[PDB]
Design a protein around this nucleic acid. Structure first.
Lengths: 244, 497, 23, 254
DNA sequence: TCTAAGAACTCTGATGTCAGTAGATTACACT
DNA sequence: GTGTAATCTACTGACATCAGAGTTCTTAGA
């Protein structure tokens, strides 16, 4: 779907931007409807989400008597759904605005954390945005610098951070946006490190077997002078076996 | 240590008047310092690890509470999982009026004996049933000679604390700005594992730091079928996984009691409490209705058994970084199955890094899940930071899209900028250069949520409202950058906006 | 050993103090 | 005692012995509650520095001085509460409260108290019911009959007063300001008098300071009037204020 | 002159997972 | 039969995760 916005490198300077999702892990359109075994009609079942207090089946009314709580150590504390909205972190706008820049080195492969990828484009028929954003990303093509950006799709939805990573194709400049972790989304564990090999020996004959495996079972064959290999198994062109 | 063992931690304050009511300044107070510490590590442990155990104890007080070895000690709190009412018990003793509130109750300055105090805490840890991974005592006394005037009193303590260390309970210390001096080399030299003002360690107990901390655990274990026959066991571990506000527990209004959501299915016509066998699943297509059982909507979507099949090898450059599916997971060996398979995995790791290569695999995390396709990129450890392992060695599972995932995006063509329009940009970009680090940001919502939750929970006068770090600090962006937005406004587009 | 391991929450690696953009 | 039974209390703090507060209440049978639900009458707290103030933020309930549950012990004080939930399904509680509350927020079906009345009052904007002329006289007559026009801060309410701060009677700047009469006009207004800057026919009283220069002229002018003002010393107002009661004029005449 | 079909995001609820605990089943065994 | 092993299979806390359902916005719109 289209989304209109304003890419903002500093308080005065805004450019028109309109991004599109590009990879999304895709799900089937029609859900499995629920149907009676003998009538085959999709409305002969009503789903009563009834409630119980455990003092011999006192049945509650959700519209009067049920209040959400959170949990705080060894005990429960009652909020109100209507007092969380009084105290909740509210974003001041449907924002997109750059925080600063830094090398490809600051951003290793592993950490990428997103539900989706955006492709983040100059607004339709804005020829001022077209020159300005082509300047932006052409000025990132050569420094190995990347952007870091606050984002938010819309009001009430969570604020968001991460890496707006540029790339180039002969017909358009790429600058994808991807989410990166906050400090509590990142897990640090000292996995017992494997170069201490004295109890798990990698001997000369084992190494001299593997040396031929990983060349021998190559998919990519060098049948070319473009320095692009045959791409013998183009997995991104295969259709999803789940839907087939 | 092993997975299940709780951290368990007991706080043990000197109630003696000579420190308790004492200051050189007016601006702090050692008891008001220790109690603040105990409330603040305890409010950290509540958000972060409700599973781990705290206790708190006053020694040398005049009215007593102990199991045995009673004289002049009061266990304010035995070992328990932490929560609000315990933080409310410590709050009562804080401050200028607090140092009188404590006096109406347990009484101050009397004689004490560390060999009995260490006895008491020992009995405490004994009395609890849970498996404990770390057993730690924290000393909040300033009394640097702990009144070892009788050396034959003091040798009891030193032997008893030999016995603490011998039983694999640990003990730890903080010194608390005693007037004129404190020196560990006089005494405490052998109780802990040149001269001090006040501990550089103690500020770390005031970090108030919040996250869940969830220990190293597998996601699952799988067999990397190289073909029809050769297999190695590997683990699958979650190095990066988005946290969520914890699931809310629905309550009864009138008593705050938890209540059961107790759902059933009921026939729209009749009293039938329909059992799961009474009803099928279905679709509509082409104005006809397709009918399948509650067994087969999940016999469809089967292909394989839990494992990882090898599919052959690629160049690392052809794995294009623009198409990315879901967060990358780690792969690491597990001798728990397939013993000695670590010998194969390690050679595979070592030699892929020479070949500049990835392995391609097909991946099923469970029975009744479709295979995805995954590139095993090989990995190498930066121990150079004095063996702070920023990166574990193994493989990354990086997932690859299929055709359906790569959504169509509209037509556009342009190659528009001149070398001056890039040239001015190459300046602003180099003026705005910082260093990102992965841990340099925090979630504005989830951090705010805990502060709201504490205000409600400990009954605080205000939500702490601590302002987030994701907003650009726009006045610094005005000044560091300077006026150069005008280079776009003049050199690049007309004055009409 | 001591150098990287937090005193509030042992075995786990010390949480550094949030950072953010500053040039 | 058999009085505090049927009245439910929360002793949310003390420190006076907190656990003995509810024990004293228990021989008066006051219904002790550890945590105030929407049922309870009121909440009692020996100090409010932290533990109470969720109940300042949630305007919920009636909060009471320590002594009110050591002075309930010589009275019978018993006064209400809340939870929170806002709802617009097909909205339901507000239309039930069109049966069950006065429109402004005072629930018909439950008593409402210090913090809850302050909140209602802060929501209001101006009107008058009955005719304004009917209402003014209902209030005036009642305070006149029962001498509550003598209420301490209102005790001169039914006095229209002129004050001798003018070197020429009724010329609005022959103004003798700097006079301790300025302070007696503050004292009269502080106790409800309709202090005035013209000696028109609406006046009941003239007040005289140290300067008696114009008393012959007030007396001579007062020969004109259809309803005749009293002339009184400064001390009538001083004494009536000190005694918290109208001392009456005829010993203070001229 | 506007009324649903198509998005989009968050949240809730079940299913499956792992580690660890401990019970009952069930094997082994008596000259 | 009677009695003592050894050891399989359960249940729970806890953590991830797909699906499914509640909710605000664009285009096509009488």
């Amino acid at each position: 779907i289209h989304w209109p916005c304003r890419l903002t490198i500093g308080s005065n300077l805004s450019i028109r931007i309109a991004a599109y999702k590009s990879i999304l892990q895709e799900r089937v359109k029609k859900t499995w409807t629920v149907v009676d075994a003998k009538t085959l009609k999709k409305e002969d079942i009503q789903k009563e989400t009834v409630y119980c207090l455990n003092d011999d089946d006192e049945t509650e009314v959700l519209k009067e008597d049920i209040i959400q709580g959170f949990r705080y150590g060894s005990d429960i504390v009652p909020f109100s759904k209507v007092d969380e909205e009084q105290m909740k972190y509210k974003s001041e706008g449907k924002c997109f605005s750059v925080l600063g820049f830094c090398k490809s080195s600051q951003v290793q492969r592993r950490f990428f954390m997103g539900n989706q990828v955006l492709k983040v484009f100059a607004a339709r028929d804005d020829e001022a945005a077209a020159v300005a954003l082509s300047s932006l990303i052409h000025a990132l093509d050569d420094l190995d610098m990347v952007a870091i950006v606050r984002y938010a799709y819309d009001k009430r939805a969570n604020p968001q951070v991460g890496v707006a990573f540029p790339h180039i194709k002969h017909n358009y400049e790429c600058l994808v946006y991807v989410q990166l972790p906050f400090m509590e989304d990142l897990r640090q564990y000292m996995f017992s490190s494997l170069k201490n090999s004295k109890k798990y020996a990698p001997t000369e004959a084992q190494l001299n077997a593997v040396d031929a495996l990983i060349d021998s079972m190559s998919l990519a064959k060098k049948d070319e002078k473009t320095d692009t290999l045959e791409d013998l198994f183009p997995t991104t062109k295969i259709p999803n076996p789940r839907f087939q | 240590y092993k997975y299940s063992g709780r951290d368990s931690l007991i706080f043990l304050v000197d109630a003696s008047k000579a420190m308790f009511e004492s200051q050189s300044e007016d601006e702090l107070t050692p008891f008001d310092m220790s109690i603040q510490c105990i409330q603040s590590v305890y409010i950290s442990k509540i958000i972060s690890s409700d599973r781990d155990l705290l206790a708190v104890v006053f020694y040398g007080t005049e009215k007593d509470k102990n199991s045995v070895n009673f004289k002049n000690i009061y266990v304010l709190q035995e070992l328990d999982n932490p929560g609000a009412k315990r933080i409310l018990e410590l709050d009562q003793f804080k401050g200028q009026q607090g140092q009188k509130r404590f006096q109406d109750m347990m009484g101050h300055g009397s004689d004490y004996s560390l060999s009995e105090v260490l006895w008491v805490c020992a009995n405490l840890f004994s009395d609890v049933q849970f498996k404990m991974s770390h057993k730690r005592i924290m000393l909040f006394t300033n009394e640097d000679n702990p009144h070892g005037n009788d050396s034959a009193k003091a040798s009891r303590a030193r032997t008893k604390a030999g016995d603490l260390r011998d039983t694999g309970i640990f003990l730890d210390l903080m010194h608390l700005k005693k007037p004129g001096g404190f020196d560990i080399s006089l005494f405490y030299r052998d109780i802990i594992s040149v001269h001090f003002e006040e501990s550089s360690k103690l500020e770390d107990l005031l970090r108030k730091v919040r996250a869940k901390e969830t220990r190293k655990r597998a996601l699952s274990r799988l067999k990397l079928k190289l073909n029809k026959d050769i297999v190695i066991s590997v683990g699958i571990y979650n190095l990066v996984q988005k946290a969520l506000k914890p699931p809310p527990i629905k309550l009864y209004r009138e008593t705050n009691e938890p209540v059961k959501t107790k759902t059933r299915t009921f026939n729209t016509s009749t009293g039938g409490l329909l059992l799961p066998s009474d009803t099928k699943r279905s679709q509509i297509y082409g104005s006809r209705q397709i009918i399948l059982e509650k067994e087969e909507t999940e016999e469809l979507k089967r292909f394989d058994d839990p494992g990882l099949m090898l599919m052959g090898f690629k160049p690392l450059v052809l794995l294009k970084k623009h198409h990315y599916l879901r967060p990358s997971l780690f792969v690491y060996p597990e001798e728990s199955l397939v013993i000695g398979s670590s010998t194969l995995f390690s050679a595979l790791l070592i030699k892929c890094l020479e070949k500049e290569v990835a392995a391609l695999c097909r991946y099923t995390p469970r029975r009744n899940i479709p295979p995805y396709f995954v590139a095993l990129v090989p990995q190498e450890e930066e121990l150079d930071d004095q063996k702070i392992q920023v990166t574990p060695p193994g493989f990354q599972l990086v997932f690859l899209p299929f055709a359906d995932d790569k959504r169509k995006m509209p037509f556009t063509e342009k190659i528009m900028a001149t070398p001056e329009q890039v040239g001015k940009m190459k300046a602003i970009v180099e003026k705005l250069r910082f260093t990102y680090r992965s841990d340099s940001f925090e979630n504005p919502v989830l951090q705010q949520h805990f502060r709201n939750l504490e205000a409600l929970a400990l009954d605080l006068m205000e939500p702490e409202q601590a302002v987030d770090l994701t907003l650009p600090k726009v006045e610094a962006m005005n000044k560091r950058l300077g006026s150069l937005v005008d280079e776009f406004k003049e050199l690049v587009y007309p004055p009409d906006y | 050993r001591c150098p990287g391991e937090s005193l509030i929450n042992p075995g786990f690696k010390s949480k550094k103090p949030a950072g953010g953009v500053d040039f | 005692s058999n009085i505090f039974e049927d009245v439910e209390f929360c002793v949310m703090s003390g420190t006076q012995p907190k656990p003995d507060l509810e024990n004293r209440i228990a021989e008066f049978g006051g219904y002790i509650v550890q945590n105030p639900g929407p049922d309870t009458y009121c909440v009692i707290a020996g100090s409010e520095n932290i533990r109470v103030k969720n109940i300042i933020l949630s305007n919920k309930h009636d909060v009471v001085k320590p002594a009110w549950l050591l002075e309930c012990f010589k009275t019978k004080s018993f006064v209400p509460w809340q939870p929170r939930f806002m709802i617009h399904m097909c909205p339901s509680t507000k239309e039930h409260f069109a049966r069950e509350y006065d429109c402004y927020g005072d629930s018909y079906f439950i008593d409402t108290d210090l913090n809850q009345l302050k909140e209602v009052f802060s929501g209001i904007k101006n009107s008058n019911e009955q005719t304004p002329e009917e209402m003014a006289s209902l209030i005036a007559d009642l305070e006149y009959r029962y001498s509550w026009d003598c209420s301490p801060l209102s005790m001169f309410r039914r006095h229209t007063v002129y004050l001798d701060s003018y070197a020429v009677i009724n010329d609005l700047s022959t103004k003798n300001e700097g006079t301790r009469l300025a302070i007696k006009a503050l004292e009269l207004r502080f106790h409800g008098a309709k202090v005035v800057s013209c000696l028109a026919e609406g006046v009941s009283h003239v007040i005289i300071g140290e300067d008696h220069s114009r008393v012959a002229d007030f007396k001579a002018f007062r020969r004109t009037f259809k309803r005749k003002f009293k002339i009184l010393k400064e001390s009538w107002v001083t004494d009536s204020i000190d005694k918290c009661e109208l001392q009456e004029e005829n010993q203070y005449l001229i």
